[PDB]
Design a protein around this ligand. Structure first.
Ligand SMILES: Nc1ncnc2c1ncn2[C@@H]1O[C@H](COP(=O)(O)O)[C@@H](O)[C@H]1O
Ligand SMILES: [Mg+2]
Ligand SMILES: [Mg+2]
Ligand SMILES: [Mg+2]
Length: 302
């Protein structure tokens, strides 16, 4: 039945459609901003439309999946449906460990727009679209679309890119690069900081600290060598924030956990909140893990 690879190949095309929606909303000018729990907790027309497109498109082709999306939404336009699939991905053999997966056992975690606050600020390259695929509680495949990749290159440039990966195959669509030798460059939240977040970072002996939006964007920073660790000692992000990004990072030898070192779980019944934060690195994960203060750990219950 070739379920996993069929799913990944469709999710790739579905994520590309999502990128067209993200760009279309900016181009038409009205972001339809709704405030949820605070002025830094926003929902736009892009979040709502992309979620409708992704969920309807996946459910049309793979009705047995469990699909969980960030937005709590109440008839979808056929114009939002994506029926395509990547023929190239479909040509790749499924890793043998996943070859007998049944569709009803997959759980898909969707963040239709990740970095929404930064989207509304015009920090457009912070934005990603995240489609994460989990089996037996583990994140095993992921798609990350970055709709404004290349947007500063001029009117003749192609906009956007799609990064995808499967554990046992690899991760693709970017150039893997380690961060500069001899430096600790720690990346973290721009808009959702607090004292605990900054105290945990201080304990790492950073040479530089980057404050940017997006969980997907920060994993891209890790795999492209713009940062050496992603440290977020706080509640606030959810399973859809970490599912697809941890796959991409794990596929190239990195590691993402909570602040204690616990792996995150992705079964259908798990709580959405990542209540003990996020710690991630491409290389030297054990260094950063070793520097988390005990006081930070006692404050953050998984
Ligand atoms: N305190 C929070 N309230 C709502 N969303 C949050 C919070 N903290 C983190 N997030 C979300 O988690 C993801 C990563 O956070 P950030 O690094 O701030 O962009 C984004 O989708 C944020 O909107
Ligand atoms: Mg949100
Ligand atoms: Mg989102
Ligand atoms: Mg998010």
């Amino acid at each position: 039945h070739n379920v996993l690879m069929r799913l990944v190949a469709s999710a790739y095309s579905i994520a590309q459609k999502a990128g067209t929606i993200v760009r279309c909303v900016i181009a038409e000018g009205d972001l339809g901003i709704v405030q949820k729990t605070s002025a830094t907790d926003l929902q736009t027309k892009a979040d709502r439309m992309v979620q409708m497109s992704i969920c309807s498109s996946l459910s049309r082709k793979f009705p047995k999946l469990t699909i969980i999306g960030e937005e709590d939404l109440p008839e979808v336009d056929q114009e939002l449906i994506e029926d395509g699939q990547s023929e190239e991905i479909l040509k790749q053999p499924c890793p043998s460990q996943y070859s007998a997966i049944k569709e009803e056992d997959l759980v898909v975690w969707v963040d239709p727009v990740d970095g929404t606050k930064e989207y509304t600020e015009g920090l457009l390259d912070n934005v990603t679209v995240l489609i994460g695929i989990a089996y037996e509680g583990k994140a095993i495949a992921g798609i990350i679309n970055q709709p404004y990749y290349n947007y500063q290159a001029g009117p003749d440039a192609v906009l956007g890119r799609t990064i995808w990966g499967v554990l046992g195959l690899g991760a693709f669509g970017f150039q893997l690069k380690e961060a500069p030798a001899g430096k600790h460059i720690i990346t973290t939240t721009r808009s959702h900081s607090n004292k605990l977040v900054t105290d945990c970072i201080a304990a790492m002996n950073p040479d530089n600290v980057l404050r940017v939006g997006g969980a997907g964007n920060k994993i891209i920073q890790l795999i492209e060598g713009k940062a050496s660790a992603y440290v977020f000692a706080s509640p606030g992000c959810k399973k859809w924030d970490t599912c697809a990004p941890e796959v991409i990072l794990h596929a190239v030898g990195g590691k993402l956990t909570d602040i204690h070192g616990n792996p995150l779980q992705y079964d259908k019944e798990v709580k959405h909140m990542n209540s003990a934060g996020v710690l991630a690195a491409l290389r030297n994960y054990e260094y950063y893990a070793s520097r988390v203060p005990e006081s930070v750990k006692s404050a953050l219950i998984p």
